RNA sequence: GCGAGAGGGACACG
């Protein structure tokens, strides 16, 4: 009977991704645990993302703002890569204004206190001498994928453009087990998990949240007698 | 001569063709 | 098939349909004389013991 | 589950609108019926709740046009499913002929209690496993399930965990205490699911031989224990079968599964068969995913010896062309020679590909598991396409010589298009023709329905049932599932005037046929629908077993429509022959009693024959033994060929009352006139069955017998007597 | 042996068949009993006639025909053929 | 899509006035005559009851002045394959002798081998020494049409599945992004610029201004031209027609350059669909028998989503009692529905609508009506109008919803051309961003059609060692028995293109790469390539390119030399015991979406002639219960269900109402009566 | 975040040592993420004890049969292997079996020293005849999982002792499935259905409790990085 | 709330 409990060691490969190493897992409890954490990471790590935007010069998603090279739907698609981190659970609103020629990027937003944009270098659109963009985005906390909330579902005005929301800080999770499996039967697994997030939260926070979700979930099994 | 060359803004779509085409498509 | 010929010669013969076939009872909307439609079962009476 | 079908909520809400209206009006959710109507039309949230409440235990009929046969329409228990597609159980696909590449299906809702009872009892999918045509199962696993189960139950020698019997140094290290221990060892990377081990099973009936060897008479298996050399795949499979079924221990080819499900259908209640089929489906899918069967460029192996044999046969073709150019033969003969040598070459290439391919290859595994495809498609895929047909039907003698893996050239592809487009157009026209034939049969035989349990008529047709062999043996007649099976004996069977083997009125199933063959008797007099004496319809006993249910037919069965649909289903699937017609048109002209386009006159009297071999015409005369007259013949071109028997009709040969003098398709009218209704009935049944077996489609004869009975109801009148008759 | 059936397959049909002669008989048997049950429920408030509404423990909102078929399973009914 | 528009043109319909019809069409006129080579594609054709009758011109075919279909040919003289193109009809073609397109000329017009495959007079194919050859095909893919020329590895597919792929390439809906194919053909670009929708500069110049609506180019000499973009225009079949610029203010553009894209074009070239990661294993039976299982990413990231614009129409017309008017004032209806309507009827731009919502508030004179006698005398005293009207407004059909794009109003007051008797005519456009859902039809280019059985979450999808989930999983039993093994080769070459490659030219070059063109021994990731139709990547080249498949980011080859990969199960966690074939496949979104197919009826309009329910999805309509279905019911022996389906569900005009009331009240179903259609038959016989 | 619907846990007893646990309604797709983990922990995380090696008197090279017993060596090893034992000492304890004369021998003959116990004395092991004598020494130890027959690494440490496969785990068989309960109103919450079957040593409820304990330990190893985290809480 | 025309989907290769 191997009397050794497992541990957890972090290895910071880069800023946005890192490898955690849990060992020694019980023979056969390798791939299993890795997948049980992969699912949790890709599914239930709460985050923030833009829920609905409003542009003064348009009323729906299928038109064009004057001047801008892209069309409202292209701007929606480009504003689907905006990674944010809101603190206040309630909905918040942040504005954006640009006049004259130039490249409108994610760095030109004016988020209120608490919330912020973590990739100023993204290209949102391009304007010209006639360009004028005035867009207010709404950010709400949530988890997973929820499609756009309908205008008539709420009391939204005509100018509202609901946008489907994908709150998921994690970006890519994988794993691999290196089991010694020596002939002396003192065998064990060595789960090397690799987690990469989209700059919203470091992989430490995502894995901690997954562990919290799982510890709380399995309370029912332990909480029986 | 890989790629369809007689169009100005052609993306460089490299091709496996072994036989040259004497006649461009009409 | 051959609606004109059969219909007209039936008219001449003044022939009478008995309405007891399987396709004849489906046109007029009656229980087909087969399966659950035959009188052995259509008239079965059930009451609690 | 096999009795369930998904149903989108958007469809269930509209179908069940009045029901949900009543249910929610009862629940105060809407004050009056009009308010309920507005609520459901606007789809307020609680509606969904009530919808489920009503939809539970309420069958709905699913149908897919064309409704070729009875199983086209079946009753499923609905349930709400997200999305907008009717989720259909895979095992019913073969019944509907439904594939999921864009099909659509229609859903009807029975309303009255009679309609609901009919949907639940007569038409429920779990109650319809066997086909109504020949009794073979149609709810069995197919395609992915068959591949998964074949991978599961196959045994791979030299695999990890194998039972190695070496002793002296250490134990065998292959035995396991229970399937629990073996699955535990398989979850760890020690024991492969396809390794020869020895388990100690205690909840599975042993094979019959082991049953007699160990327990003897009445070993009650769920408690006892017995050792079994097997593979954990087979052990896991046998947990899917019912408790009492003996351990099978065989590689689960599709035919083996067919035998197993036939045994289950015959010997067990339909509910047990449905549950076993569902569990087989689940295991088959689960182990098809793990089977690792994939197709890739690397796994489509090419035969290494292609070049040498191709050069050999190209040299032979060059020689044939060379001697053609020298005038050695005409163009027809040289086309024949090229076609022959290239057919031989393609057959050889297929053989070489077959021998070169490994055993566990994905393509060879898929074809050899019975799941899909035939080896010809693999030969074309790797090997060579072979000969290709011209639009007229002749063979292009080139031929194509590049496999689809190697890639055809421009002209070879062009040649292939001929056959492809020809096949498609033929398919459409044949579909139309077979539809017409099905309509005609259904309209000529609908009024044949079972009416009496038994007419007690002593008459009955005869069945050959494994004729004698020249050396002297009982070689089983190949086509027995259609003729002898599922019929009731008209007279008892005896051997050498000994004890009775099978009494009159026996179902005559498979055990019964084995008893017959063991006793040595060959011929059996069995009742049929031809001899049934009932005034209206047919008596139940004469008809025999109902193929679907498996027991004797009911008193209300509409056997006529069942027979018509059975004969019309394999239509759209008969191919012609490359003159004696032998395709669907042959069936059409045979069931229409047409004068055959290729009549082969049969004699009308026995005795020696004066042959007069006619040139551009013919002439035959049979010396009558009544001596009445040697019925003379003429107008028969010098094309037909004397039929071959015992020997081919020879000068002075002793003919019979129906010896086909020449070759061709005899006429039912003349053979009726000359022999009688018995012989014309047997002739019609034999020809229709032969045509349907040219394509290898199995139909039980009793459907053809129903149709042929409906042919010969009427008699012509020669003398009116004195009663109103023309 | 019959594993626990569910939904529309319960009670097992093959056990019902022994309580009748043919499948068609079971159809009409159950349908007529279901009409009786629905009629009891529908007009229970007033002076119910010879309709003997449910005989086996009815479900909370068991559909009439289901109660009927279960009754037939428990040998709680009799029939006279046409 | 542009391909369908292009292919409808160039189509050759063998039926019409002065030509044979379908019933008159036999089973020999539909074949592929040997004279179709180079004049009519033998692959592309409808597969319904139109096979052979409807075809399409080959790529190089030109029509003679008299009407015959010519074909170019390279005349060979003295054994030298010159470049003197000459056009021949069928008569000249079969008069002379023609060699195959792919013959090994020795870089000077002389063949290598004596025996070359030659087409003789009467369509025969034989081998002839290189002395009698008189003509040569200009190039391979001279036989195929434009639609079929876009199928990569066509010479490995079968004629049936090639035909299906060619037919299905004309059915893809235009997506929102329209990524170009990783593996394609040289025909995409030409088939795109000739389709017409790709906006092209006629004369060179320098871009002056660019915006979503216009692209203003400055030419070399004085003249300026503002190309007007076509944004969100409804096509004839309901799809979108967006054009987006692909140039900036500083670019200079040569004459004939692709200035802007169309619906399905990506920087000039045709893009009918998207490249998704494909695995070729049978996954838990959800992808069973042509069913395909997608990943939720395709829904999350809008990989496969299309904008569909539906058009609704209503006209106010002069009625017998007066005129028809469209106003916000409407007979009794809760006021909330008027919230979306504007002051003058038609709804406001950008307003979401659903089934049963009002699009055009319309009323018509109710008819002659009777006042109560006291009301009537009081109204005669008033002189008041009846003010009756009956509300009949444009409401969307069931199962429709989405934003409102445009309201186009036509009135006689504006001096327009309207049909006589019509005062007002207003069009409303309603768009919906249809995602990909269960049952929507997806198909590659080689005839691998299939509906979407299930859309698994991203987490429970097979993922490579890198952790990238497979976007779609195709069954493996559908490949071998259809002889369409080009989907596998397309998969392999797609992986090679996505991951790039670099042939090790350290010791010369590998033998298999001897004939490989230069600047193919290396290729960066996402390096689009092209395999022409009948001259493209060989099997040996594919094996070689898979041998060198340079690692993505770390030291790791996800897909080994066999084209297969080690896949980790998404649910059980443990890897699949054997490697799986993974790659990138170009699959498309066919226009057979479920939202257009689902239908349900319980009560609707009825035919007045015979009282059967109406038919079709446009109206409510009920699914037909034909003769064959009734035969099946009779076979079962279900008399009562047949009576139900034929008597009180369809024609018992006195019975349908009773059935509705009985079900609503919960009573027993009433007994059926006699169908009205039988009474109609009786009256007609009389 | 508040789940808004707490999963429950109910059971339906099938036998004295067997159960069909139901967990419902788990989030989508929180049926497979924990079903497999619970299965693996049940199978190979609950400590137990069992035999590891055995030496039989009278047999040294002929590993097929044994004198004076109607059975053979394979039968004996099979019988001993399916024997339930509970122990507390970590080092390999040794046990003795000895029956002289004819008759039958069960699991009641093995004398357990202090600490080790047998929960099924009435289990037939073998039979003896013709004044036959059986004398067998067993080695029993505690551990986890399923250790195959350990190879005799020592050249001659145990000449008469042969190793054997060993079933340490208390739970013999676990299976699981999921469903799509309440697709519409509850948005397709999964229903995990575990079917667990265990040796007498413990009821399946106790096995699930221990599995939950070890699972919470292993998954809390991840939680002990950022305690002030955000995640799903049943509350 | 019918008719004609056109296009299109689904339909056994042993
Ligand atoms: Mg289909
Ligand atoms: Zn009879």
Numbering used by the authors:
A (entry chain A): 2 to 226
B (entry chain C): 26 to 51
C (entry chain D): 1227 to 1275
D (entry chain D): 437 to 1014, 1023 to 1090, 1097 to 1176
E (entry chain E): 28 to 109
F (entry chain C): 444 to 1129
G (entry chain B): 1 to 235
Sentences from the paper on this structure:
RNA polymerase (RNAP) is the central enzyme in transcription. In bacteria, the core enzyme (subunit composition α2ββ‘ω) catalyzes all templated RNA synthesis. Promoter-specific initiation is directed by a dissociable promoter-specificity subunit, the σ factor, which must bind to core, forming the holoenzyme (holo). Here, we present seven distinct intermediates showing the structural details of M. tuberculosis RNA polymerase initial transcribing complexes and promoter escape, using a de novo cryo-electron microscopy approach.
Our pathway concludes with a backtracked TEC, which appears to have fulfilled all steps of the promoter escape to-do list. Here, the cryo-EM map shows three nucleotides extruding into the secondary channel, alongside features consistent with complete TEC formation in this structure, such as the complete release of σ and RbpA, together with the rewinding of the upstream edge of the transcription bubble. Density for the RNA-DNA hybrid allows us to determine the register for the RNA sequence in the RNA-DNA hybrid within the RNAP cleft (+3 to +12 for this structure). This register is distinct from others in our data, as the RNAP has advanced further into the DNA fragment than in all other observed structures. As this is the only TEC we have been able to isolate in our dataset, we believe it is a 21mer, which, given the identifiable register and cryo-EM map density in the secondary channel, indicates backtracking. Lastly, our MtbGreA results indicate that the 21mer TEC is highly prone to backtracking upon incorporation of the 3ʹ-deoxy-UTP chain terminator. Due to the high CarD concentration in our cryoEM sample, we observe partial binding of CarD’s RID to the RNAP β protrusion, consistent with prior biochemical findings. Lastly, we characterized a backtracked de-novo TEC, concluding the productive transcription initiation pathway.
